[model samples]
Target: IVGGYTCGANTVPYQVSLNSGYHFCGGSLINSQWVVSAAHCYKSGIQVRLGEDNINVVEGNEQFISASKSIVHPSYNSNTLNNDIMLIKLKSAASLNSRVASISLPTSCASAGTQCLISGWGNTKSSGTSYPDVLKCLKAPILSDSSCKSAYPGQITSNMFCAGYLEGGKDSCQGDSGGPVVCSGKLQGIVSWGSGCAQKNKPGVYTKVCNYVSWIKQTIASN
Candidate 1:
């Protein structure tokens, strides 16, 4: 999803497609049995798929697992989209292989102007309906909260951040609602939403992953 080109197959092992029986959202493998995604992606019939590059067909290295437990943060706010993140507990641990692995979480906050990669299987264009069969990636720069706030006043919170081009074009759009914003090879953000896909002055909003390390750890620990 967003304005990006196709990524080399299996390049992003932590990436996964949160399939809701039919349509899918993107997620990342945080641990063998845990995946982190946007809280808005939380819905029924969701399944976790790992190791596969092409989500449409069953690949040799793919690991598809049923959701054992899904936890949405108790403080999750649908209105402001604060704490728009969730953890998916797989019924079984994923088999570690070349095509399957976990991504490291950020220990600190990401600075503005940092270049990051966003990966997903969402719409290529803002208003388009079709989603890619293969995974896609977009390279974008993390914008300052004030800069992003100008685009979405009183909407961006401490838990949310932004990344994209100010001129227009190149951003994460629909179906990318629960994807990863990887910076310096670490998980930094999750594709939350945007005003429109690749629009001018409108950057993609993301759930700041670094802001929820405690929630992630505690949730997995208790569950």
Candidate 2:
């Protein structure tokens, strides 16, 4: 059996390695030198790989980047899961390859209720076991602002957006946090929170990518 959840089926795009054998949730390459992911997934002595399939397979062909430093949003609270964002600065810019390409940040044209693609090596079924070396992905339409707000009550702030199935079943689970929520080839959100995996009345909450654009740009500039 795998460790946490089976992310192999959802086709999650990024693989973060903490000490060679240990791997956490997925992430996205926002730039040649920066990777956007969840704060909780940040750790020292970790390396990140983009454009890879199985986490265990590295044939010296993939784009491997060393995480020289990690900056989790200062206000991020693990327990409450507020500000659950982070950036990993690669030691050197990644060389662009067919398999390795940076995901674009959301611009003005993006908005609520957009259809987005979320990929991960998360649980295939809610409460199911994890897959050791497989990846998975799925599509989820963006939730309406009002519907999202109604779902979480006090939790879904303006800084967050919601996605996933309203009728329950499919969703981003344990190993899916910090992954990209891409729409129209642009990143619109980052998987951040949800009440439980695919539960009714609880949609998967994401950090609003547009709201954090300035913050992300400023952080990259200063770093």
Candidate 3:
């Protein structure tokens, strides 16, 4: 499964897989040995695939690695979508090749209006229900903190960031959770939630990457 904006030719989509032959959600690689994704995607026998188009088929030289361990933020609350970040430790380091490469994490918080790229295989239209095989990507500019807060009221917390078209009809949806919201080639956030799939004025919410630097660093170091 995958999710994200589907606008014209540029679409950002994520891919995820489950144990029961079910594929859902998208995720991003943070390093050669770890991937950053949403905590809600955590499920028994869950596995993540990077740089692959099809979730059902393990084709070509597509790198496949099992997660040796998973660390979901202790503060994550599924009821509120708070602290929705998680890390997946791979059983082995992945090769740094063209087909598979890790995305760098942002060292600091991005300013509002920063253009970010999101990718996944989620629904193409608002209210539509389906998952595609090909990956799609889209670009959305970050909204000012004040503006985002005003739009969502108290829902936009300091640990969260927002992005999407204000006019709506273009945002991440189901199957896109846990993928990277990359800005300036660094991962600034991970897709978390929205008012629904591409609802008007409801930009997608993501876990702010900058807020969990310590946890990420510590987790990686210990591993």
Candidate 4:
């Protein structure tokens, strides 16, 4: 995350790193057996590591589990990046403890101007190769639909919402896609995309979790 700091140990228990030998994206544990992430982050044989604060360290609190199945949103569009959400079922259920727990999904939408917290192990710079080992977090406000549309004309969609400063400085970048953006302690967004990492007039866009609440519940119930 750009202009962010390392997260405290066990503070972000729901955060998980999506890896295939190396950490590439971040995800949130929604339940013992399911995780929520960006559809675009999907890859065959991806592994989910829970209770991770630092990716490089041994971190005895970590639980590494392979994915049993991955379900991408049916209406997801790669070109437009609409409905950019996905669910991954773990090969085995996670053992929830003080170091690992699920985050509650938001029942209602986060309003514009609401302050949110976004955490990830993505790059710390907008144009560099500095992907942090420790998870980093940044506090940003959700931008209004109209404001988001104005900033990225013809790109903003109902399933997507923008968050971060219009003048730049803080955001979720590469390797952070599929991470959680929490508002009021509830999962409200999934890091989806943006024009550039924390660029002026280019706030970070996310998969609006509020729009997919029922979809998530139904998916988990059926599968």
Return the TM-score for each candidate structure: 0.96, 0.86, 0.89, 0.98
Model 1 vs. true fold: TM:
0.96
* Best-performing candidate as measured by lDDT: 4
Greater TM-score among 2 and 4 belongs to 4
Q: Let me know the TM-score candidate 2 reaches against the reference structure.
A: 0.86
Q: Which stretches of candidate 2 lie over 4 Å from their true place?
A: 1-20
Best by TM-score: 4
Candidates' RMSD to native: 1.1, 3.6, 3.2, 0.8
What is the model-wide C-alpha lDDT for candidate 2?
0.73
lDDT of candidate 2 over 87-172, digit per residue (tens): 88989997766556788887753566677778665665666665446556667878888999899777767777888778888788
* C-alpha lDDT of residue 16 in model 2: 34
For lDDT, candidate 2 versus 4, the one ahead is 4
Model 3 over residues 14-69: C-alpha lDDT tens digits? 22332224656667776788888889888756665655766556656466678788
Residue 56, candidate 2: how far off, in angstroms?
Answer: 2.1
Off by over 4 Å in 1: none
Ranking by TM-score: 4, 1, 3, 2
Query: In model 2, what is the error at residue 8, expressed in angstroms?
Result: 11
